């Protein structure tokens, strides 16, 4: 998420971050419902309005949406108290954004992006590039446990595969930025270049990495100016558990076969079936069923996207109901101590056990206290010394 990353940051970088058209429009584009209204209202103001009038601009109904908005709005340090004038590094550059101060494009963008997603499955046309191979492992979606000729795929790597196309691109860039503090450049110029792409010497090396996932295009082996692609902006399912996907690409076939089993393969159409024994093969690695319905709700046919609610509700709960078979019997381990002749001394052992957070379950019939074995070493020190 973007406001998750921008919330936990220093004030000394956000003032540098607010670029001339780039970041001031980008942060303002992601503000929940009402934070866009107050930023617009006091954009042309110069005298700071009183801080108590802001809560009076909202009805008493839907007041809980006010504090979560201004908490995020003051969390990014857009205004301050000052006695609520906006930041002059933000109010000026946002007012610059209000007018102040190629069929080869998309086909290159999709093909250069599937060969990165093909690296997380079995394919002979692997993205042979030593920079990306260490990049995916330090992000935590390619298990190695060995130098190895093949790299494996962890449980988080399967969850990466069934995300949306823009949503899986942001998860990659946040783990590019979190590691670039100690191996690359400053955080300010790399993040302002991405937002300026959406509308120094170290930046060509970052541009040569965006060349490989596919967000720019050179066409003459790193010329002066680049050209951005469509990736740089930021299948029916029926009642009888059968899905008819119209994709002919090999990447979309291996994503469907992760959680279903296939029974025919025509050109330009592949029919599979969501069986019970194949969803249980998916959650065994753990691709849990909320991501399954989210994978089918984004990728859908226009005939699915009709006046009916998409992904009809007898198959969406059934995948949730097939998730709960793994759930029956929960494996939470503990240890036990009992057999006191007195009916009072175990009640004094409650007051020495709740405050650390070790007690798991309480029984008042036979006075059965269960604690975790990681926390069993400290509870016995009170019992032998009274």
């Amino acid at each position: 998420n973007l406001q998750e990353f921008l919330g936990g940051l220093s004030p000394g970088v956000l003032d540098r971050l607010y670029g001339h058209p780039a970041t001031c429009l980008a942060v303002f584009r992601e503000l929940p419902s009402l934070a866009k209204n107050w930023v617009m209202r006091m954009l042309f103001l110069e005298q700071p309005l009183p801080q108590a009038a802001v809560a009076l601009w909202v009805k008493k109904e839907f007041s809980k949406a006010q504090e979560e908005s201004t908490g995020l709005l003051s969390g990014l340090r857009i205004w301050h108290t000052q006695l609520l004038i906006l930041n002059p590094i933000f109010r000026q550059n946002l007012r610059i954004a209000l007018l102040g101060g190629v069929p080869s494009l998309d086909k290159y963008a999709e093909e250069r992006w599937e060969v990165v997603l093909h690296f997380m499955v079995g394919s002979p046309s692997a993205a042979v590039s030593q920079d990306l191979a260490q990049l995916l492992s330090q992000a935590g979606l390619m298990k190695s446990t060995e130098p190895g000729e093949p790299p494996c795929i962890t449980s988080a790597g399967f969850q990466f595969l069934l995300l949306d196309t823009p949503a899986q691109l942001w998860y990659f860039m946040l783990q590019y930025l979190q590691t670039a503090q100690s191996r690359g450049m400053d955080l300010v110029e790399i993040l302002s270049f991405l937002f300026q792409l959406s509308f120094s010497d170290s930046l060509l090396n970052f541009l040569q990495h965006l060349r490989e996932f596919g967000l720019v295009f050179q066409r003459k082996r790193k010329s002066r100016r680049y050209y951005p692609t469509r990736l740089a902006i930021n299948i029916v399912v029926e009642t009888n558990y059968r899905l008819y996907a119209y994709t002919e690409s090999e990447l979309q076939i291996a994503l469907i076969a992760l959680f279903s089993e296939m029974l025919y393969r025509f050109p330009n159409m592949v029919v599979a079936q969501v069986t019970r024994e194949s969803v249980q093969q998916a959650i065994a690695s753990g691709i849990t069923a909320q991501q399954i319905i989210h994978f089918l709700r984004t990728r859908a046919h226009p005939v699915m996207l009709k006046q009916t609610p998409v992904l009809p509700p007898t198959i969406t709960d059934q995948i949730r109901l097939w998730e709960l078979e793994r759930d029956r019997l929960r494996f939470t381990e503990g240890v036990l101590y009992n057999q006191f002749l007195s009916q009072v001394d175990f009640e004094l052992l409650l007051a020495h056990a709740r405050e650390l957070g070790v007690l798991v379950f309480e029984n008042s019939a036979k006075r059965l206290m269960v604690v975790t074995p990681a926390g069993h070493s400290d509870v016995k020190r009170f019992w032998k010394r009274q």
Binding site: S33, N37, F44, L56, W57, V58, K59, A65, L98, L99
Partner: protein
């Protein structure tokens, strides 16, 4: 989502009157209030649409169709072309406005129309003004309005049949701050914010022969045509 049509009263008689009145508010400082609110509607969401219609005498061109720097040069070129039967026709532009909303709603959305009226209300179009209101009411299209000099009688009914707002601004050069506060929020955020209430509603009817506004008059019972104080016979049927 959130298609917003702006209908600006581009009557060259009243703006040219204020251009010689020296009231420090010309047409140029009013289209700037349209262009900034035009640019500000394209910021609150990624997929937001804009349309600007200029109401001239005997004609009415679309301004914006024919990132924001590709929007603002079209508007300043069309206004420089249009401003180069002395009463405005606001009803002919809202009929064009509902056609553009009906086309963009077929290619997919809630929409609204914001009218900035600057001339006096012509009562000669009461038969056609009410038809574009009831067409807007059955498609849940709000008709917001702000006036500059005097309360338009026909335009107050458009904001209460459909469900929009009506605000007479006190000052001309403070228009841009007023637009952002009371019209820049969309339909859902308008319920959460607090806004000025409607101060007066002006319901009248036009006579068929006089086309005059009437508080007490005679209606026919079969053809339902309201007449002024005559009652000699049923003129329509």
């Amino acid at each position: 989502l959130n298609l917003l049509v702006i209908v600006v009263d581009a009557n060259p008689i009243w703006w040219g009157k204020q251009a010689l009145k020296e009231s420090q508010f010309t047409l140029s400082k009013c289209i700037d209030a349209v262009m900034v609110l035009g640019n500000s509607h394209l910021f609150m969401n990624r997929s937001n649409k804009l349309a600007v219609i200029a109401s001239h005498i005997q004609e009415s061109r679309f301004l914006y169709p024919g990132l924001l720097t590709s929007a603002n040069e079209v508007i300043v070129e069309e206004i420089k072309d249009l401003m180069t039967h002395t009463e405005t026709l606001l009803a002919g532009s809202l009929a064009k406005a509902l056609c553009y909303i009906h086309r963009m709603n077929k290619e997919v959305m809630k929409s609204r129309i914001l009218v900035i009226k600057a001339a006096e209300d012509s009562a000669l179009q009461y038969m056609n003004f009410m038809n574009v209101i009831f067409a807007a009411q059955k498609q849940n299209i709000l008709i917001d309005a702000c006036v500059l000099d005097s309360d338009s009688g026909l335009l107050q009914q458009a904001c209460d049949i459909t469900g929009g707002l009506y605000l007479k601004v006190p000052q001309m050069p403070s228009l841009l701050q007023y637009l952002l506060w009371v019209f820049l929020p969309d339909q859902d955020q308008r319920s959460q914010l607090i806004l000025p209430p409607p101060v007066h509603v002006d319901y009248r009817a036009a006579c068929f022969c006089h086309r005059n506004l009437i508080e007490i008059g005679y209606v026919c019972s079969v053809c339902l045509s309201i007449f002024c104080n005559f009652s000699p016979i049923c003129t329509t049927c």
